Amino acid sequence: STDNAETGVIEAGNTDTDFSGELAAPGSNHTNVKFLFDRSRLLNVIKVLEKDAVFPRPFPTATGTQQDDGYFCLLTPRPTVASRPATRFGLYVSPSDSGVLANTSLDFNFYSLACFTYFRSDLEVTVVSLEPDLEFAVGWFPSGSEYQASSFVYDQLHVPYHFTGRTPRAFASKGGKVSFVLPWNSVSSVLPVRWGGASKLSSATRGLPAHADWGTIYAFIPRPNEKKSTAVKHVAVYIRYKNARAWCPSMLPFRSYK
Amino acid sequence: STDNAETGVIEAGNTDTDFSGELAAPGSNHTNVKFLFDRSRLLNVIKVLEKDAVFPRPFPTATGTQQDDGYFCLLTPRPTVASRPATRFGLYVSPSDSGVLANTSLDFNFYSLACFTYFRSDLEVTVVSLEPDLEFAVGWFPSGSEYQASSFVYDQLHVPYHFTGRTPRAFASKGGKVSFVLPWNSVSSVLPVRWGGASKLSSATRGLPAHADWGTIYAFIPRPNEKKSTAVKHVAVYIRYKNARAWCPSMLPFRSYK
Amino acid sequence: DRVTTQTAGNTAINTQSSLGVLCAYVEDPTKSDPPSSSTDQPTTTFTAIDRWYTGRLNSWTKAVKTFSFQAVPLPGAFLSRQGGLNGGAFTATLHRHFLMKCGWQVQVQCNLTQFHQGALLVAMVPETTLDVKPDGKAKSLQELNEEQWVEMSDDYRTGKNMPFQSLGTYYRPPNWTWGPNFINPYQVTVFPHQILNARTSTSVDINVPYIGETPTQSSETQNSWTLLVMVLVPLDYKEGATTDPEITFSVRPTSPYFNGLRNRYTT
Amino acid sequence: GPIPTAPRENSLMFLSTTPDDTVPAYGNVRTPPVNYLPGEITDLLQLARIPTLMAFGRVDAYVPYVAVPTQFDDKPLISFPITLSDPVYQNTLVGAISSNFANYRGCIQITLTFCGPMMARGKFLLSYSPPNGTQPQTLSEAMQCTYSIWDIGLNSSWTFVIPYISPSDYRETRAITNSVYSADGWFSLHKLTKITLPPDCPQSPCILFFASAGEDYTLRLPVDCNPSYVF
Amino acid sequence: GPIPTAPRENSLMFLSTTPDDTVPAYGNVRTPPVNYLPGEITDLLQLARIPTLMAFGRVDAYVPYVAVPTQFDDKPLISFPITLSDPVYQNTLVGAISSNFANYRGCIQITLTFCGPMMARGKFLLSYSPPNGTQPQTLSEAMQCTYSIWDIGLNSSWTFVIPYISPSDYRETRAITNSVYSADGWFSLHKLTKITLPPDCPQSPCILFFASAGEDYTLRLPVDCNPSYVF
Amino acid sequence: SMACYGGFDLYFILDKSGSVLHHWNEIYYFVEQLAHKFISPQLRMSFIVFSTRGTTLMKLTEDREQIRQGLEELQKVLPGGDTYMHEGFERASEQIYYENRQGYRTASVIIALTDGELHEDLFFYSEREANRSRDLGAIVYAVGVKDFNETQLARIADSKDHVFPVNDGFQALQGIIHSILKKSC
Amino acid sequence: RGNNGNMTFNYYANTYQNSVDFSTSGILNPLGYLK
Amino acid sequence: RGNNGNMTFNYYANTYQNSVDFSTSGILNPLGYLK
Ligand SMILES: [Mg+2]
């Protein structure tokens, strides 16, 4: 019908508006935000700790720093790099062996439907092993805490300080999984899917939120540091957004035409 | 008694109609349609995926196409071939090794009692392993969806895209089974046991329904593609028709006399 | 009594050996609501398609064996003009609508004298591909004249010859042995049927509703019913009686619903 | 806190016919409605009651009728044992639904139809013998059993309802067992008086046989079917 | 004491979309309130209804409008199949929310806007053909389909609502399948009368196309999305 | 070869498709006329049929009672089914390869019959199996019952010189089969 | 009710367990009526 | 209520399961109002 799209509001018509027709019956409510993000999906495949770690030092990290990379999973749909939140998402195309390949992550199923700016939800974290008969454990520390990185000698065995704490270290049975729901613990009222301000941090970068995360999990093996194995064991972190709310509609990513 | 069978309706008599007799008491209701198809039976023995698959390309498939056959189980009592719905059912009598032996299937217990034309029911799928100590997983995609066939590199391990999704990937415990009931998800109002129309598809063939299915399951092993084994592992798919309704009576198959 | 004139539109038909109208699956198969899979207004019945369409059918000789059938698809006989069966203003509307949802009402006439014997089995057989050669393509008017009566072979009893898809050079072609659009010739009386015996009647009367996997089906590619004249007892007479009695049929669509108007169907 | 349970010996057993549900996976699916479809089979005994044709070996080309010769003989014109595994019952809806079960109970209803000319007059005796040591062949041996005389006239069908005479309440639907002269006895169509046809009428008319189920035919105990229809 | 349970065959199974909760770990967290934020998306169909731009290949530099030449031709000025996988629908909010689903149902609403000068006068025919064997190109072949004539005047937008004409209640949102002339048919913008411009006005004005969803556009069955936006 | 053949065989690979349903009374006359003409004990013959299952109706035998018992079976064969001509050739390929393992330099001759020519998915395998049987050392003749493309049988036989209509077929194969009998030992 | 002995307690709701039809707006009857 | 079929029984309390907001003191409305 006769309209003005320069107005900015176009009323959603039906077939009966211009023609002779009828309204179709409403099919289903699967587009509900609380329904559509309330399902699990893979976030990041992280290695499993076998000793007391060294958490990745903040950027710009110089060479020679003996730290432990690819062990901590900053639980965020936004793009991360080296277990710390980033802006751009980078994947290595031809990863030659000069320098440390930084473990990046992103929630591919989220941004293809993240047609909004702010998003708040609880987080159900399921940590599925990627190793036959792995008895692991899933430590965690909230948004705004740091990793306790040393070891205390119990009975001539370097038991690290990430076995205990006031934060949930769920121990898995052998051949089992770990699943627990994390509350919204960040200091921001919502998580910015898209952020345009500047974080007044270690040198300020536009478009990088400081506390848009549910925390950081890491997997360790419940043995002291003398019982260290040799081969590298991985674990996979699935994530479900319980009780999702979303505000302020925005864009969906640019699907190319080639 | 005196009747006319040219009329087309013969009233079901008893012994008391012509003779001196009595009505026998009603035995049981095991001929009830909702009772008689609500029991599990084997559908198809499918191989278990060990990498990111290539779904079978539609017919006529030419030689040289590197695809993965015999992995997808189009969940239908009607005859299938190469994980796609067919009309005729073909079994290889003397299968010589020229060409790819296409995995056909059929529900033998269904058509011997499918004395009707249209049939609608939910579907309970139990996927029993045929391998000692097999930890598998049962992916699925509905009637009218396609298989997501690639791999995303998590931690230098080609984890395929059939680990995640919005459709149920049930993971089995080791030595265990997978059982879940699927709703009626096809776009047709009922499933035609016998269909006489033509599917206006890739070149149209009479008697072939396009969306007479509950979906397609496939079994995969939850390891990345670098952990590929050598020997072929099978899995068996049992199927139960929950809450069956059936319309429009028809014929039962021709039992021969030789 | 047994004299029922079935007036419909501007075309009425008489019979003086009427067994009765075998209404199928319901009391009144004329009552039919509109399709629920359309968001436009359907073209309902009107008084130029509410009438009978007499068309011929091949003669019934002594050479015909037992169970030799002869299939007349509905609406597939209106569109290919099978047996001189011009659809009139029904086919002029069926070509211009995409979906069509009707229930039929047929009547097969075959006049046997009291000195003939034989029994046709007329039945409205749902969802069959009996008009299609075991090689996909549908039968033209020449191939219905080149055989006159399709013999119930083993390929029809097992459903071995229903149309298939070419699997291509990649797959080894499997030995097809069965397909679900068979005919079990002994169980055709489960369908809405009457027997056209040579000593009770000369006209059977079947009235079927719309059945189909969708609440309305496509117009060009549906075969949800199939008239099926099957010989149970072969014709026999002494030399002097009227050889080769003709068989006709008379199809009337009860309460159609045409949805999805477009121009006349060009392949 | 924890409810102290004690799982049984049949824990983690997959039984195929457990009378119980299971966990949903992909629920809240509104299906499109089937209010438009007529003729719903509520019960598969709505189809055993529909009479279907039998198959008699002629004097894999079998014949649903009995050709009636003009030659006198004191044996039944056709005779077949009342057993729903017998090959005159494979392609009925009575004998092909019941062969997929294990027991039955009630009255088989054999419908006839004289498909000869209208000017034929004749009578047929229709004897169901219970299981004897010897199958009755003489008309006088079959007059004594459960019979009924069918006079050919205007109405051209006769529904001889076979009684359910058996000790056990549910007969076995499949007598493939070490066999004898088979219970449950024999149906037999005797021609009582010869069919008198006027001149210039075809010799040997045809009695088309049907086989339906009674209004008290009841089935029990599903079994796995024979999959030999597909080979 | 112990409640005797019997755990099922799907014990210790991790299903990703189980419609159920799980054990808390770190509860009793009062979150800071979000009463201040306006504009909460309660439902993602509040964004398919917002009209976004389409993308037409010009006569990865695509154009949201249709340049209108001054040369007469009896073919549609632009024509594109109504399929939400078609690349004139990848970067709409209708076709990029629905490509992350499996079914849809309802009315796509194509909004136009004549972004030419104010002194232009013209008319445009707007035909939606249902799926035919051949795409209609002549104006007389598209006059017969579902059309509507749009007269350029003071108000400069027209919302042609494409009907939902389909047999199945929910159409497939992604026709990447062995393909033919594609259901659900073709939209086509025909210029009926030529655009008559006064002197010293620019030749070839521009019809900016939009694509929203109707008031009855409904989506069903989430699927895993294509992650190829990130490569 | 200049060395005479120690054995000499003959394969009647016969179609029983739905297309030959009105022509089986002519195909059966062609086979009996070639069996009851060559009564030499040097020649063995085998009857292979195909519609959907390629089935050896009589093995490679020479006993003229068995061949008469074989020909009394071919008269009562009902046509019908598809045309899997590759499975007609696989039953002969299981017999050529079994008889190449005797130490006798024999000579396999294959006679094919077809009305309804093959679809592309079936012509690809029947051309493949006819290449397989020639690699096993056979001479494929393609006798044609009514209207047939010679090109669809040019690949199946040795060449276009080896494809014959059925009315000329016994006129052709009178001395064509007899030419190797004098060549033999 | 089918092959279902759970007369007592349905854990999952009817929409999740079964699949109900959406809205459009004993005595064994015969399948053929002579009229 | 979300993707939650547990209509019957919540074991954990609402504060432990969810995360309620602390205090400061159907009909799909449009996201843009022309005034
Ligand atoms: Mg042929």
Domain ranges of chain C: 1-267
Closest CA to D212 of D101, D54, D87, D63: D54
Beta-ladder partners of B216: B74, B141
Yes or no: say if C216 and C33 are a contact pair by the CB < 8 Å rule.
no
Query: CB H28 to CB E42 under 8 A?
Result: yes
Does the structural domain E1-231 have CATH classification 3.30.2310.20?
A: no
Residue E222, classed as helix, strand or coil, is strand
CA B3 to mean position of chain CA atoms: 44
The DSSP bridge pattern shows strands F8-15 and E101-105 to be: unpaired
Measured CA to CA, the distance from residue C68 to residue C57 in angstroms comes to: 14
Query: CB B4 to CB C19 under 8 A?
Result: yes
CA dihedral B114, B115, B117, B118 (to 10 degrees): -60
Residue A36, classed as helix, strand or coil, is helix
Residue A245, classed as helix, strand or coil, is strand
| A64 and chain E in contact, CB less than 8 A | no
- Partners of C26 on chain G (C-beta within 8 Å) are 33
Q: Is E189 exposed, middle or buried (0-12, 13-18, 19+ CB in 10 A)?
A: buried
Residues across chain C: 267
- Partners of B119 on chain C (C-beta within 8 Å) are none
Chains in contact with B, counting 3 or more C-beta pairs less than 8 Å apart as contact: A, C, D, E, F, G
- Partners of B173 on chain A (C-beta within 8 Å) are 175
Residue of G nearest to B33 (CA): G2
**Cα Dmax for chain E:** 97
Q: Using CA of residue C78, residue C81, residue C84, residue C90, what is the dihedral sign?
A: positive
Detail the DSSP E strand segments found in chain A.
2-3, 41-49, 72-74, 80-81, 84-85, 104-105, 116-120, 123-129, 137-141, 151-154, 157-160, 170-171, 178-182, 191-192, 216-220, 234-240, 245-249
Residues at the binding site of F for a divalent metal cation are 17, 19, 83
Which method resolved this structure? Answer: cryo-EM
CATH superfamily, with its number, for domain F1-185: von Willebrand factor, type A domain (3.40.50.410)
User: What is the b/e burial string over C1-30, where b = at least 16 CB atoms within 10 angstroms of the residue's CB?
Assistant: eeebebeeeeeebebebbbbbbbbbbeebe
Yes or no: say if A187 and A252 are a contact pair by the CB < 8 Å rule.
no
Q: How many CB pairs under 8 A join C and G?
A: 22
Measured CA to CA, the distance from residue D164 to residue D108 in angstroms comes to: 8
Yes or no: say if B105 and B73 are a contact pair by the CB < 8 Å rule.
yes
Residue given tokens 């490679």 in the structure block: F60
Angle at A26 between CA A20 and CA A27, to 5 degrees: 125
| A21 and chain C in contact, CB less than 8 A | yes
Closest CA to D206 of C202, C198, C184: C198
CATH number reported for the structural domain that contains residue B46 in this entry: 2.60.120.20
* Helix count and strand count (H, E) for chain E: 3, 13
Beta-ladder partners of D61: none
Query: CB D38 to CB C209 under 8 A?
Result: yes
User: What is the b/e burial string over A244-255, where b = at least 16 CB atoms within 10 angstroms of the residue's CB?
Assistant: bbbbbbeebbeb
| A27 and chain D in contact, CB less than 8 A | yes
Measured CA to CA, the distance from residue D50 to residue G30 in angstroms comes to: 9
Assigned token pair, C133: 């050669």
- Partners of H5 on chain G (C-beta within 8 Å) are 12-13, 16
Query: CB D53 to CB C232 under 8 A?
Result: yes
* Helix count and strand count (H, E) for chain B: 3, 19
Assigned token pair, D6: 């004690």
Q: How many Å lie between the alpha carbon of B199 and the closest alpha carbon of chain C? A: 7
Residue given tokens 């011997």 in the structure block: B112
Q: DSSP readout, B159-201?
A: EETTSS-SS--EEPPTT--EEEEEP---SSSSEESS--SB--S
DSSP letter assigned to residue D41: E
H/E/C letters for each residue in A93-121?
A: CCCCCCCCCCCEECCHHHHCCCCEEEEEC
Query: CB B184 to CB G34 under 8 A?
Result: no
Query: CB D32 to CB E169 under 8 A?
Result: yes
Smallest Cβ distance to C41: which of A20, A23, A24?
A20
- Partners of E8 on chain D (C-beta within 8 Å) are 12, 22-23
Assigned token pair, H5: 């079929």
Angle at C19 between CA C18 and CA C23, to 5 degrees: 110
Angle at C108 between CA C104 and CA C112, to 5 degrees: 170
Smallest Cβ distance to E6: which of D3, D8, D23?
D8
Query: CB F119 to CB C166 under 8 A?
Result: yes
Residues across chain D: 231
CA dihedral C80, C85, C89, C92 (to 10 degrees): 10
Angle at E19 between CA A129 and CA E169, to 5 degrees: 120
Task: Give the H/E segment covering residue F56.
Answer: strand F54-61
State the alpha helices, DSSP H only, in chain C: 76-80, 91-94, 154-157
Q: How many Å lie between the alpha carbon of C218 and the closest alpha carbon of chain E? A: 8
11-70 in chain C: CB under 8 A from chain G? 20-27, 36
Q: How far is the CA of C57 from the centre of ligand 1 (A)?
A: 27
E36: Cα within 13 Å, side-chain hemisphere: 8
| B190 and chain D in contact, CB less than 8 A | yes
* C-alpha gyration radius of chain E: 24
Q: How many CB pairs under 8 A join A and D?
A: 4
Smallest Cβ distance to C214: which of E141, E165, E167?
E167
Q: Using CA of residue C151, residue C152, residue C153, residue C155, what is the dihedral sign?
A: positive
Measured CA to CA, the distance from residue B145 to residue C175 in angstroms comes to: 30
Task: Give the H/E segment covering residue B74.
Answer: strand B72-74
Residue F27, classed as helix, strand or coil, is helix
DSSP letter assigned to residue C147: T
Q: How far is the CA of D120 from the centre of ligand 1 (A)?
A: 46
| F125 and chain B in contact, CB less than 8 A | yes
Assigned token pair, C114: 């009291």
Measured CA to CA, the distance from residue F62 to residue F42 in angstroms comes to: 8
Yes or no: say if B167 and B143 are a contact pair by the CB < 8 Å rule.
no
Smallest Cβ distance to E27: which of H15, H28, H31?
H15
State the alpha helices, DSSP H only, in C88-128: 91-94
Residue F38, classed as helix, strand or coil, is coil
Yes or no: say if C214 and B210 are a contact pair by the CB < 8 Å rule.
no
CA dihedral F18, F19, F23, F25 (to 10 degrees): -20
Measured CA to CA, the distance from residue B219 to residue B130 in angstroms comes to: 12
Measured CA to CA, the distance from residue C144 to residue C141 in angstroms comes to: 5
Measured CA to CA, the distance from residue C72 to residue C78 in angstroms comes to: 10
CA A25 to mean position of chain CA atoms: 38
Q: How far is the CA of F149 from the centre of ligand 1 (A)?
A: 13
Q: How far is the CA of B258 from the centre of ligand 1 (A)?
A: 25
Q: How far is the CA of F32 from the centre of ligand 1 (A)?
A: 21
Assigned token pair, A98: 């000069």
34-63 in chain C: CB under 8 A from chain E? 36-40
State the alpha helices, DSSP H only, in chain B: 15-18, 33-36, 108-111
Smallest Cβ distance to G16: which of D19, D24, D30?
D24
Assigned token pair, F29: 């006359």
Residue D1, classed as helix, strand or coil, is coil
- Partners of C184 on chain B (C-beta within 8 Å) are 251-254
N-terminal to C-terminal alpha carbon distance within chain B: 35
Closest CA to B157 of B47, B49, B51, B48: B51
Yes or no: say if C144 and C82 are a contact pair by the CB < 8 Å rule.
yes
Smallest Cβ distance to B61: which of C127, C170, C177?
C170
Residue of E nearest to A258 (CA): E60
Residue given tokens 């062949």 in the structure block: D137
Task: Give the H/E segment covering residue H29.
Answer: none
- Partners of A249 on chain H (C-beta within 8 Å) are 31
The angle that helices F24-35 and F169-176 make with each other, rounded to 10 degrees, is 20
Q: Which amino acid is at C113?
A: T
The residues near C242 (Cβ < 8 Å, ≥ 6 apart) are C113, C116
The residues near E3 (Cβ < 8 Å, ≥ 6 apart) are D3, D4, D5, D6
CATH topology of domain C1-267: Jelly Rolls (2.60.120)
Measured CA to CA, the distance from residue E127 to residue E130 in angstroms comes to: 10
Measured CA to CA, the distance from residue B146 to residue E173 in angstroms comes to: 12
For B114, the domain range is: 1-258
Residue D131, classed as helix, strand or coil, is coil
Domain total of chain A: 1
Yes or no: say if G35 and C23 are a contact pair by the CB < 8 Å rule.
yes
- Partners of F86 on chain C (C-beta within 8 Å) are 173
Q: How far is the CA of C70 from the centre of ligand 1 (A)?
A: 22
The DSSP bridge pattern shows strands F108-113 and F8-15 to be: parallel
118-157 in chain C: CB under 8 A from chain A? none
How many C-beta atoms lie closer than 10 Å to residue E128's C-beta?
Answer: 22
Measured CA to CA, the distance from residue C159 to residue C163 in angstroms comes to: 10
Smallest Cβ distance to C99: which of E129, E136, E167?
E167
Q: How far is the CA of F119 from the centre of ligand 1 (A)?
A: 10
Yes or no: say if B135 and B172 are a contact pair by the CB < 8 Å rule.
yes
Angle at A181 between CA A177 and CA A187, to 5 degrees: 135
